[PDB]
């Protein structure tokens, strides 16, 4: 005979749903688990209705603000990169840098990279890779570990569109026959960050034109 008339679920998968209002010996008899006679017995009071006392969403003062200007980077630890390298998944030709796009391709970072990647230092001891990295930013300790390894980090600015283009340049080419140009940092805070040598920002490390233009304006 066909298997189709002899298939069961795996043991522990299914259950019988508790069926109310269906006789006394059932257990869930006349009252059907409701108790006896109150508002909850025949009607609806809200779960978090605290009775009339000042509730736990009212006693306490409202705290903080939502920074809409915030753009949370996805964190990538050096440890994970090292592990990838050990596994022989970190496929890089000599000279080619491990950029955010490259990380995504490899599966170092996974899921949607909306705003960027920060490189943190959770396995800085056993990190020994002389490859060059490039991300939104890195932790100071992580940077130091990279330097020790014989590597080279560069914090690179990416607007959300610019980041997207970096991650998936072929899509833009398919759609429009042209990948979009990478934007300059318009914001003051961003400019300041990438102008820091301590952060290994690209504007100082590559000696950018924007920074020079700003200096000229300041002079004049």
């Amino acid at each position: 005979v066909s298997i189709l008339g002899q298939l069961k679920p795996s043991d522990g998968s299914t259950k019988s749903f508790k069926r109310l209002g269906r006789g006394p010996s059932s257990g869930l008899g006349k009252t059907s688990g409701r108790g006896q006679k109150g508002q909850k017995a025949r009607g609806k009071v809200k779960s978090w209705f605290e009775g009339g006392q000042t509730p736990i969403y009212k006693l306490f003062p409202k705290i903080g603000f939502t920074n809409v200007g915030a753009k949370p980077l996805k964190e990538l630890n050096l440890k994970r990169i090292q592990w990838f390298h050990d596994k022989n998944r970190l496929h890089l030709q000599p000279g080619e840098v491990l950029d955010m796009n490259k990380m995504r391709k490899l599966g170092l970072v996974t899921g949607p990279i909306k705003y960027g990647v920060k490189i943190l230092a959770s396995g800085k001891f056993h990190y020994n890779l002389p490859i060059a990295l490039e991300a939104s930013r890195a932790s100071a300790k992580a940077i130091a570990a990279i330097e020790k390894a014989g590597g080279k980090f560069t914090a690179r600015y990416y607007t959300p569109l610019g980041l997207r283009a970096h991650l998936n340049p072929q899509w833009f080419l398919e759609k429009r026959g042209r990948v979009p140009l990478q934007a300059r940092p318009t914001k003051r805070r961003d400019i300041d960050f990438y102008s820091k040598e301590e952060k290994r920002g690209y504007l100082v490390m590559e000696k950018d034109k924007l920074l020079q233009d700003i200096k000229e304006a300041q002079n004049k």
Partner: protein, 106 residues
């Protein structure tokens, strides 16, 4: 590259019912990314830790016995082999030890 290879290149030992894989022998296949299928699992609301071992081909009982022999420090009781899906559950977070034991062959 080809899903079904040609009749010439396939050896006799590669076929089913050859080399006696069913009788008292086993295999433990690695994951897609290429790691040992041994996992911590935090059941009953983080209260019950257990170590699960997946992707076992062939005789699971024999494999379990071999692992017990390798790791005498874990008790005999705490080795629940669920037969429907063929995976062997251990009580503690004994993942790393299991991996160490398996690596040399699988």
């Amino acid at each position: 590259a080809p899903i079904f290879p040609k009749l010439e290149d396939v050896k006799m030992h590669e076929l089913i019912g050859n080399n006696n894989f069913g009788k008292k022998t086993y295999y433990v296949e690695r994951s897609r990314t290429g790691n040992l299928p041994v996992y911590s699992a935090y059941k009953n609301g983080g209260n019950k830790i257990i170590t699960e071992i997946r992707k076992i081909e062939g005789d699971v009982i024999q494999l379990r016995n071999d692992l017990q022999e390798q790791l005498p420090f874990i008790p005999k009781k705490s080795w629940s082999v669920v037969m429907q899906s063929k995976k062997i559950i251990i009580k503690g977070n004994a993942v790393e030890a299991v991996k160490r034991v398996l690596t040399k062959k699988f």
